[PDB]
Design a binder for this molecule. Structure first.
Ligand SMILES: Nc1nc2c(ncn2[C@@H]2O[C@H](COP(=O)(O)OP(=O)(O)CP(=O)(O)O)[C@@H](O)[C@H]2O)c(=O)[nH]1
Ligand SMILES: *C(=O)[C@@H](N)CCCC[NH3+]
Lengths: 61, 205, 82, 85, 392
RNA sequence: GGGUCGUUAGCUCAGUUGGUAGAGCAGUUGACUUUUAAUCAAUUGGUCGCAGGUUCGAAUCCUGCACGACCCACCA
RNA sequence: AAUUGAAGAGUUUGAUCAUGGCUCAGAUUGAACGCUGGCGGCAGGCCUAACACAUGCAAGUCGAACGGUAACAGGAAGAAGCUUGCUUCUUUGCUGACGAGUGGCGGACGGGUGAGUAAUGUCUGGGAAACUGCCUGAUGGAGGGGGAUAACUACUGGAAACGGUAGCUAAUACCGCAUAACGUCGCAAGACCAAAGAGGGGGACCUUCGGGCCUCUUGCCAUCGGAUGUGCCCAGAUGGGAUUAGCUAGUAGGUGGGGUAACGGCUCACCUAGGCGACGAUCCCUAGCUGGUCUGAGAGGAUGACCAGCCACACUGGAACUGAGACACGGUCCAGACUCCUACGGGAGGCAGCAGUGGGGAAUAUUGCACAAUGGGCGCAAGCCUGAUGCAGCCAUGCCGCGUGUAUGAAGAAGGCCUUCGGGUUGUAAAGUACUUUCAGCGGGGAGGAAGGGAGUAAAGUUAAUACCUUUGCUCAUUGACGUUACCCGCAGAAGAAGCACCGGCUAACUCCGUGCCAGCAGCCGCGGUAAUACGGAGGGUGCAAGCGUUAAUCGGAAUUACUGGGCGUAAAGCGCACGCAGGCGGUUUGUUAAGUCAGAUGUGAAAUCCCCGGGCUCAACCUGGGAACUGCAUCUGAUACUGGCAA
């Protein structure tokens, strides 16, 4: 089981994703994360900082 | 590669001017110097141990405009040499072609000197070099490939360059405007205001 | 059979043929009995660019080391009297 | 497999019918010597060996035998009969 | 793979269309049967075409089959079109790949609504070259019946904008044409005469950059992803790299082999029905609807402006009205993407039988171009005719 | 590419002669308590996935489109 | 000249000092993912499926071994039109040459993978009971005959694959005979064994006018060699587990017979009853090994993708043939599975060769060019084959270099942002302005990698020869995949090339707003319950740079497995105590021995790589010369105090 970073995903029942390492150490038992910007998992909407993580592209306009 | 941004911001950041804004008007003063590196340049730093080690490392690197990954190679290069790595590094941070071009008087600024090297404006010992990071050996002859001779800039550079300190380990023709390099650099003739033992600790960690 | 041939070392577009004595069937950069001199196709005008000890070669010739053409060309190039 | 060396595939088959035949009579002449050794007749094997000695070394140079096994064939068998005769 | 292909004579994409079940498979089988005696490349049997499982399961054409033949003068890359209602959408891909539509309707059947579906789609895609073939004519030896159905054809061609005033009609029977009985094979030869007659040689759009709406892509054994389809405009050759435009976000693809009917085409060109192998691309990404464009020539548009003709009940469509917000699918030369009717200010209702215009809100960002005439269907039925005005 | 079954407040999941859709889990609104648990009632909340159509009337049926888990494929 | 080299911090408590875990700060990589992205040089690029494979190609060459000529092009006996010599053309192996076949050689090389393998392997150094194509040194022979067969023809089974029978015929194919030695058997005497011709040219003599014959090049056969490669053997070293303690019966050795190139239980017959094992046998799991790589002050630890050597395998299991050599990648046979074709009778297929495909997966590329250069194969040569190799393509994957401009510039602007709304800050930053153009982009020139080889010819050898062939120059034409090359010249004009992370502390660098233990952050301690430098945005600032972050794995920090270099009264840890076998340590004196030990030398420690000192690439990366080193191991010669053995 893994944590879902950011403030909103779009995953449900399936929506295949990618898993990277790291435990949150906050909700013990979960030692994995989910990659925003990977497969069916999009990027966190409205991110203007640290968008290297959370798979957010540069604001075009 | 080069910083190419606000090149005087570092002057306020390191307090002592880095000779970046030398150009023509040596009278700097137009930046509210020493008191406003940023929106909160009013605060006073406690500036810890790692701080003073880093601030010096940047001051040295930022004066010559070198980059960390290459500068790291310069440390190990200074370490593989015999003798004190401190002096071994100051040599390598001086033998740079564009810097040698600057030291002769060919250049208003150290960076403008690189613009010459980039634009084939130099011919040393019968060879035109583009390599700014060229390690000029002691006693060589740096000159200008004719297409870029005194083209409004070399004269403009040497004009203020006559008020320069004029290093001892080199000579200049100034008639034909050719650099007559001599012996290698030595601790006394160079800097003597920077601190070399600080950076050796920086790469120790 | 043992042959005296080059070995082609160096890099891309700047070859450095390594004249060496190897077990003929082996690889170009493969095993060899022992190396002897070398050749540089791009050092034509400098201190060197072609080294070779003709003594050890003759020692092997007496054993039957068939010299490859390019290397044989070198013996003539290191001049039998120059 | 497709290769002009399929000739080498069938030549091996061609040469083997020949080679086996050669070894066939050869090994039987050796068996003809042991028959005499199992007979104890000093003359029989001596006749059989004098018969097989020229027929065995003749095979050595032909490449059928490695001449050392042939030498061994000549050796011990004779070493048996001289010890017996 | 085999056989290096030569661009001998000009191609003319033809096919068999009309109301479901009039003999279009036997006919297509018979077309190749004819020239087998004179020309080399022909002679394709009934089972040679009926190879698809479900196409075999009914004995009718559902999967869009393909064959090759030609007259002693010009080439013909035929399209064995399906007639079943669901696959009529799949015959549109072939209709939007066809240069000449041969209206195959039997004299003992008469112009039906499923016939008129294929007809509106034909003109609204770009086909003006049309000859007509009447099948099953051995049944009704009543010539009086023939001249009323012929009347209906020229009226219907005029009804859905086709030159019925210059449309040859062939009252034949393709079954006896496939029986080997030369007489009805001669009836096909009558149309074979018309084959070079009505349709001239069109324009090759080679000058302009490469462009191509995808028809078919398969998991080719030992090669991978091979895209097939007639070139929109422009040419290609083995070793050049073009861009894949379409619903997805545009990127590159290389020509790693160009072929035509299992025959090695040396160099691709506009119009010629080509099968091209693509480097790097996989079966999953690519499909019909997208575009193989010469790099950076198409803006990935989201919406556009156009006018939509509305069929009434008898016209084959709307038996009851609609309005703004309506969701039909606009077919762009090969596609089936929902082009929602978004009528600007005022027009808030449309009855069956109008030519209503509106700026569309397309569901997918497709490769758009101003001036495209497109045929529209909605919910298993055609709703009318369309023509692109502007593109957002 | 085709053909069968699916999508319910913000969420888990209901409602067969087609007659105006349900709680449980969120909160908000006051005391208590440093602030919570415990304790209490009022209460908005689906635009019944999206589009039109059959009927007087559609969560119910007609297909389609987005998107799923299934059966055949096709084989330049 | 050739190691001048080693850092800490945050976290238990009200607080402190300990032990102690824990986590970060560093570096690294076949990396992947995300945001992002201008160019070039040089490297690497399927570690998951040792899963299955369509297509093409990856090993052929010699007419200077032979019978032949089916093709292509000549000569020619002849032929056909008709411009009777312009053409046409049925025949012909007489040539240049050449399909298919005989045969010699190679296919046992190069290339790929790491499944298996815990020792039949490797690394290291020694050893004797070995064989060895091609190359090369020496000594000699190289006589004279015979019988078949392929090809080619006829008939014929068969869908195909693929045969069957009857005739033809050659040789460096094959088989006898002669002759044999320092060769093989045997102590010896004796006994016995081999083969092959062709090619260029040629005066005389001679032509059953094939040629005999001369001369030279090349080849054949045998013996001894060497060189080379390979086989074989000994000892040591070579992961984890004792919750694997006894293992084994060709097993341990002898003898005789046989067998391998060679010794041997390699294999048999019989006798003996042993041999291995706590200094780890057998068994189980994993895993190719080393040189090397990353890291570490060093010792060590981890690891060993690439480059090279060794080992092993080729769809699975096993077997054997040809052959110097395989018990064989693109060889054969059997049996199985997985596929393909079929007339369903029967056959065919092996990408772990280079590309490529489906698939697996987080993920790693073109079905390109040339044999121009090196290497290899065959050949006398010329050449021909070469997915070895040399090159280009695609990927920022890494390493390195360059560029994205310089200078001037105060209304100290606009607006953003904070504000003690005084103003400060952004910010010489920008605009404006004076110059400049690297790299790209477009238009022209132009290195070096190319040595040779061809033909003609001169001269020195050759010899009866001024002929041929060999050696050394001359001459002309030239031979380059890359290649619209590197580099040079010129053109428009700053024009086309900077983002990414972080800012509580650790750890460089801050505020205001929005949200209120909610939403979120995170590597660790821990922040958010209304005023957050820890969330989300904005401005500012810092780090780094064509990269910046994240996860992964390795080592360091870790003296938290401590030989270097730790501990046990209470923090973890003295067996409950004692005797006692093996093992470990051992008073003192003399002598001796020289095993350890130390010195010196020798052989070796493959190269490459790491280090030092130079050089060539515009520099660097890189390539590279010579040195050093490879800390070791075996032998020989010394010292012989110290320890060990021996005597007293
Ligand atoms: N009398 C007669 N019968 C015919 C003729 N042609 C075909 N039939 C029969 O008509 C039927 C339809 O054949 P088919 O060729 O599949 O038709 P189609 O027109 O392709 C049908 P789809 O609409 O699915 O594509 C078959 O039964 C065929 O044998 C004809 O010329 N005359
Ligand atoms: C394959 O047959 C193509 N190359 C030819 C045109 C038909 C495309 N469906």
């Amino acid at each position: 089981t893994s944590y879902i970073g950011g403030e909103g995903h779009n995953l449900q029942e399936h929506s295949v994703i990618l898993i990277r390492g790291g435990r949150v150490k906050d909700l013990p038992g979960v030692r994995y994360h989910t990659v925003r910007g990977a497969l069916d998992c999009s990027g966190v909407k409205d991110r203007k900082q640290a968008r290297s993580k959370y798979g957010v592209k540069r604001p075009k306009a | 590669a080069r910083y190419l941004g606000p090149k005087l911001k570092l002057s306020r950041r390191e307090g002592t001017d880095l000779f970046l804004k030398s150009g023509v008007r040596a009278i700097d003063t137009k930046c509210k110097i020493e008191q406003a590196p940023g929106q909160h340049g009013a605060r006073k730093p406690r500036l810890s141990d790692y701080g003073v080690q880093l601030r010096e490392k940047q001051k040295v690197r930022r004066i010559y405009g070198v980059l960390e990954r290459q500068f790291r190679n310069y440390y190990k290069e200074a370490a593989r040499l015999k003798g004190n790595t401190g002096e071994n590094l100051l040599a390598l941070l001086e033998g740079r072609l564009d810097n040698v071009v600057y030291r002769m008087g060919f250049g208003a600024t150290r960076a403008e000197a690189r613009q010459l090297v980039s634009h084939k404006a130099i011919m040393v010992n019968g060879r035109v070099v583009n390599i700014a990071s060229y390690q000029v050996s002691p006693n060589d002859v740096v000159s200008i490939r004719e297409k870029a001779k005194k083209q409004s800039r070399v004269k403009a550079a040497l004009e203020l360059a006559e008020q320069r300190e004029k290093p001892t380990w080199l000579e200049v023709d100034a008639g034909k405007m050719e650099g007559t390099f001599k012996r290698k650099p030595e601790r006394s003739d160079l800097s003597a205001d920077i601190n070399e033992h600080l950076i050796v600790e920086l790469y120790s960690k | 059979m043992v042959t005296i041939r080059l070995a082609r070392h160096g890099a891309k577009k700047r070859p450095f043929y390594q004249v060496v004595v190897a077990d003929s069937r082996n690889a170009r950069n493969g095993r060899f009995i022992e190396r002897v001199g070398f050749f540089n196709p791009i050092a034509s005008e400098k201190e060197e660019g072609t080294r070779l000890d003709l003594d050890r070669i003759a020692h092997w010739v007496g054993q039957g080391a068939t010299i490859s053409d390019r290397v044989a060309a070198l013996i003539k190039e290191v001049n039998k009297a120059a | 497999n497709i290769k002009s060396a399929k000739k080498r595939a069938i030549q091996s088959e061609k040469a083997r019918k020949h080679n086996a035949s050669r070894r066939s009579m050869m090994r039987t002449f050796i068996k003809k010597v042991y028959a005499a050794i199992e007979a104890g007749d000093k003359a029989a094997a001596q006749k059989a060996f004098n018969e097989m000695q020229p027929i065995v070394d003749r095979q050595a140079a032909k490449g059928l035998i490695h001449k050392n096994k042939a030498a061994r064939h000549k050796a011990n068998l004779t070493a048996q009969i001289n010890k017996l005769a | 793979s085999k056989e290096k292909f030569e661009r001998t004579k000009p191609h003319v994409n033809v096919g068999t269309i009309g109301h479901v079940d009039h003999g279009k498979t036997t006919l297509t089988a018979a077309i190749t049967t004819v020239l087998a005696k004179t020309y080399g490349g022909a002679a394709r049997a009934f089972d040679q075409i009926d190879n698809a499982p479900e196409e075999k399961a009914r004995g009718i054409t559902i999967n869009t089959s393909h064959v090759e033949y030609d007259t002693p003068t010009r080439h013909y890359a035929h399209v064995d079109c399906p007639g079943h209602a669901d696959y009529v959408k799949n015959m549109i891909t072939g209709a939007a790949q066809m240069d000449g539509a041969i209206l195959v309707v039997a004299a003992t059947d008469g112009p039906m609504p499923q016939t008129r579906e294929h007809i509106l789609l034909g003109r609204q895609v770009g086909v003006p070259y049309i000859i007509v073939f009447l099948n099953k004519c051995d049944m009704v030896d009543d010539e009086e019946l023939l001249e009323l159905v012929e009347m209906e054809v020229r009226e219907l061609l005029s009804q859905y904008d086709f030159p019925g005033d210059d449309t040859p009609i062939v009252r034949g029977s393709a079954l006896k044409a496939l029986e080997g009985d030369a007489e009805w094979e001669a009836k096909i030869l009558e149309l074979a005469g018309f084959l070079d007659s009505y349709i001239p040689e069109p324009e090759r759009a080679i000058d302009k950059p490469f462009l191509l709406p995808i028809e078919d892509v398969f998991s080719i054994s030992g090669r991978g992803t091979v895209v097939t389809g007639r070139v929109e405009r422009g040419i290609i050759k083995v070793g050049e790299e073009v861009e894949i435009v379409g619903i997805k976000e545009t990127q590159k693809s290389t020509c790693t082999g160009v072929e035509m009917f299992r025959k090695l085409l040396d160099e691709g060109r506009a119009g010629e029905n080509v099968g091209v192998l693509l480097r790097g691309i996989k079966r999953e990404e690519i499909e019909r609807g997208q575009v193989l464009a010469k790099p950076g020539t198409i803006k990935p548009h989201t919406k556009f402006e156009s006018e939509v003709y509305i069929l009434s009940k008898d016209e084959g469509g709307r038996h009851t009205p609609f309005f703004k917000g309506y969701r039909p699918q606009f077919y762009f030369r090969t596609t089936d993407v929902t082009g929602t009717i978004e009528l600007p200010e005022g027009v808030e209702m449309v009855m069956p039988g109008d030519n209503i215009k509106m700026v569309v809100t397309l569901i997918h960002p497709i490769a758009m171009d101003d001036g495209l005439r497109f045929a529209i269907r909605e919910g298993g039925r055609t709703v009318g005719a369309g023509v692109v005005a502007k593109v957002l």
